[PDB]
Each structure stands twice: as C-alpha cells, then as structure tokens.
Amino acid sequence: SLPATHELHIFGSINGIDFDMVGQGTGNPNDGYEELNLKSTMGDLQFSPWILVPHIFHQYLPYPDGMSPFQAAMVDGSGYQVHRTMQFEDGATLTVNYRYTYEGSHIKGEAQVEGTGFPADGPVMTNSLTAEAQMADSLTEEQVSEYKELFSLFDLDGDGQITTKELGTVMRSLDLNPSESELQDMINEVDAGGDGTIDFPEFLTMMTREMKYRDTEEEIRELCKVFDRDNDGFIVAAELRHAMTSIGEELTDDEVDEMIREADQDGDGRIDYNEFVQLKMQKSGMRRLLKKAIDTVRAINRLREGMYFADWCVSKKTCPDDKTIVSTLKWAFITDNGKRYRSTARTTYTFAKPMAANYLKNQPMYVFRKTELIHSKTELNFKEWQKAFTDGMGMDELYK
Numbered sequence: 001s002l003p004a005t006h007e008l009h010i011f012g013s014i015n016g017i018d019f020d021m022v023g024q025g026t027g028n029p030n031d032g033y034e035e036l037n038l039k040s041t042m043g044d045l046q047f048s049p050w051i052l053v054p055h056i057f058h059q060y061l062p063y064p065d066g067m068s069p070f071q072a073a074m075v076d077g078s079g080y081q082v083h084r085t086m087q088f089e090d091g092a093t094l095t096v097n098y099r100y101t102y103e104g105s106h107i108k109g110e111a112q113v114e115g116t117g118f119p120a121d122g123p124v125m126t127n128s129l130t131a132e133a134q135m136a137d138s139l140t141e142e143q144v145s146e147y148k149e150l151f152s153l154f155d156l157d158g159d160g161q162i163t164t165k166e167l168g169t170v171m172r173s174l175d176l177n178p179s180e181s182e183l184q185d186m187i188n189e190v191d192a193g194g195d196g197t198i199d200f201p202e203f204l205t206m207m208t209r210e211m212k213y214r215d216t217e218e219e220i221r222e223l224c225k226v227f228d229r230d231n232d233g234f235i236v237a238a239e240l241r242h243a244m245t246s247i248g249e250e251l252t253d254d255e256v257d258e259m260i261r262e263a264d265q266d267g268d269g270r271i272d273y274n275e276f277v278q279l280k281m282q283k284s285g286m287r288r289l290l291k292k293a294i295d296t297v298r299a300i301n302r303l304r305e306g307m308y309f310a311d312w313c314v315s316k317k318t319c320p321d322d323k324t325i326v327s328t329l330k331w332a333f334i335t336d337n338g339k340r341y342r343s344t345a346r347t348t349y350t351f352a353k354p355m356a357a358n359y360l361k362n363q364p365m366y367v368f369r370k371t372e373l374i375h376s377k378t379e380l381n382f383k384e385w386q387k388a389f390t391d392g393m394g395m396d397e398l399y400k
C-alpha cells in the first residue's frame with residue numbers, strides 16, 4: 001500500500017559536469033509533505049544545487065476526493081515513468097527521466113539528469129541562486145520610518161495593531177470591496193502571533209518578504225497602471241491628486257508641481273513609468289508623500305497575494321489519453337542580486353495501466369507546491385509541500 005519512506009539516486013551532468021547523489025527521506029501520503037536528505041558520492045557540487053530543485057515523488061500526493069493517479073499506480077504495483085524537460089529564460093535546457101521500484105511502503109527512485117547551455121557566468125554556474133537574496137533584512141533609518149508611517153495609515157486608532165475592521169476601512173477608501181471572510185484570510189496569512197491581528201513586526205515581515213514571481217522593481221512597475229487612470233503611460237497632476245485623496249491627503253497647486261519636478265528626470269513636465277519606478281527605487285515633503293501612496297497600494301496587494309496562496313508554484317495537470325498525464329508550470333528562483341531566474345517545465349507521466357474513469361473526467365487538476373532547500377557543497381536537505389485542487393472558473397488564471 002501507500003508510501004512512508006523513500007530514497008533517491010539522482011545523477012547525470014550539468015554543462016558536462018558529472019554529479020551523483022544518494023540519500024533517504026520520508027513523507028506523509030495524507031497531506032503530500034516530503035523531506036529528503038542527499039549527499040554527493042563524487043566531490044563538491046560545481047554548480048548551484050538549486051538546479052536539482054524541483055526535481056528531487058508524487059506517490060506522496062493525495063487528490064481532493066481520494067488517492068491521486070500517482071498513488072493508485074503505486075498501490076496496485078503497476079507504476080509510471082516520468083520524463084521532464086525544463087526550458088530556461090537564458091536558453092538552457094534540462095531533461096530528467098525517472099524510474100521507481102516499490103518494496104511495501106518504501107520507494108526507490110532513479111533520476112537521470114541532463115542540463116546544457118547554462119551561460120558560464122550565469123547564476124547556475126556561478127552558484128548565485130538562493131532562498132533569500134543578499135539585502136534581505138537590511139533597512140536604512142529612512143526605510144524603517146516609511147514602514148512605520150505606512151503602518152500608522154493602517155492602524156487607524158493608533159493601538160499598535162491592524163485588525164480586520166481597520167484593513168476593511170482603508171481598503172474601502174481605496175475603492176476596494178473585500179468581504180469579512182477575505183479580511184480574515186488576509187490577516188491570518190500575516191499573523192504569526194495567532195491573536196487575529198497584525199502588529200508592526202508582522203507587518204514589516206509582510207512588506208519585506210521576497211515573493212517568488214516578482215522582484216521589487218517588477219512589483220513597482222505593476223503599480224504604475226493603478227496610478228495612471230487613463231493608461232496614456234503618464235501620471236499627471238490630476239492623477240497625483242486622485243491618488244493623494246485616497247490616502248486622505250490634500251495638496252495645493254505648488255505642492256503638486258513640486259511632486260512632479262521631484263519625479264521628473266528629463267524636464268518634459270510629465271512622470272512616465274521609468275521615472276515613477278526611479279522615484280520609488282531611489283536611496284521632498286512631497287517625495288515622502290508619494291512613496292507612501294505607492295507603498296499603500298503595494299501593501300494592499302501583498303496582503304491580497306498571500307490569501308489565494310500565490311507564493312506557491314502552481315502546476316496544471318491534464319490527461320490526453322488514459323495512460324498519460326501532462327503537467328506544466330512556470331518556475332522561478334531567487335538570485336543573490338535580488339533578481340528572478342525563470343523557466344517553464346513540461347512533465348509527461350506514462351502509466352502502464354489505464355487510469356480510472358474519475359481521473360479522466362476531473363481534468364485539469366491544479367497542484368500548488370512549495371519547496372525549501374538548505375545545502376552545503378556535498379549535502380542537501382529538501383522539503384516539499386503539496387495540495388491538489390479541482391478545476392473551477394478562473395483557476396486557469398491563478399495558474400497563468
């Protein structure tokens with residue numbers, strides 16, 4: 001029947017550098033959690049150990065309504081083989097092939113890897129991928145102030161706690177329409193304390209966290225569309241005023257002009273997207289005010305992108321015939337320098353035995369996953385979490 005422990009022999013080459021790793025792990029067939037330890041049998045890793053992620057056992061994955069095809073095919077002994085190709089933003093490719101054997105509740109996996117065309121000075125070969133960038137948790141006194149100011153705007157009474165009702169109030173002034181229950185979900189995500197509210201430290205964590213799919217620049221570039229009410233690509237006095245009024249702030253004509261000249265870095269009279277990104281990225285009364293309006297939008301949004309758990313990677317699985325599942329995902333690692341390094345994957349599962357009827361009817365499935373890696377030169381500790389969801393309207397949209 002179902003698995004409890006596993007091992008992995010993963011080997012092959014990355015840009016013609018051979019590697020070989022073995023180790024033992026465990027996991028839970030009821031919630032899809034796994035953990036694995038691996039060690040090199042063949043020297044120090046000469047490339048980012050992160051390229052082995054996510055490749056380093058869907059037999060641990062349950063479906064909403066019972067076993068997944070992956071478990072069913074373990075339980076009855078009939079098995080599946082796996083082929084995965086992953087294409088990287090910089091032109092590299094990686095192929096992995098997998099074969100499994102079962103002895104009761106223990107899985108032995110064999111994974112053969114081939115990656116090529118990683119640029120010699122890119123993040124893979126120069127060991128620059130990471131869990132969390134350099135910069136992380138480093139704050140100037142100015143950033144600490146801005147964050148305290150931003151907290152104040154949310155903490156309406158001044159009691160040092162956010163709470164659902166205040167987040168509602170602020171979000172309403174911004175012309176948003178969250179339900180009680182959505183407010184509940186937003187707070188819960190960010191409330192490590194468990195007291196059903198958001199204090200400054202939890203808030204500063206939410207503001208500082210590196211999101212898997214956006215770097216800070218990309219996040220700010222996104223917010224531009226919001227300030228630019230008519231989508232001309234410029235942000236004008238009338239638009240600065242609309243923005244300032246929703247954060248309860250006034251502005252004379254002089255105050256507005258100052259705000260423009262402050263962001264205006266080519267003297268034209270207009271604020272474009274590049275200039276708007278620059279003002280936020282920098283390092284006077286009016287500067288500070290604008291940055292706060294920008295960050296208010298960033299905050300709301302970070303609060304929304306936590307609830308529909310979108311720091312997870314989302315896979316789309318379909319069944320083209322009764323012995324095949326095809327899964328696709330978009331993937332991102334964090335670099336040292338604070339960037340995202342991106343790729344797409346396609347994985348094909350070949351089953352020996354025709355999949356049961358329910359699986360061929362309930363397609364696509366969406367599977368959300370989170371991984372973690374800690375590594376040395378010779379040794380990795382890996383963890384994965386997984387949850388499967390059925391199709392619904394606009395699932396196929398969380399996925400994109």
Ligand SMILES: [Ca+2]
Pocket residue numbers: 155156157158159160161162163166
């Ligand atoms: Ca309060």
Ligand SMILES: [Ca+2]
Pocket residue numbers: 191192193194195196197198199202
């Ligand atoms: Ca709390």
Ligand SMILES: [Ca+2]
Pocket residue numbers: 228229230231232233234235236239
């Ligand atoms: Ca405009």
Ligand SMILES: [Ca+2]
Pocket residue numbers: 264265266267268269270271272275
């Ligand atoms: Ca300009």
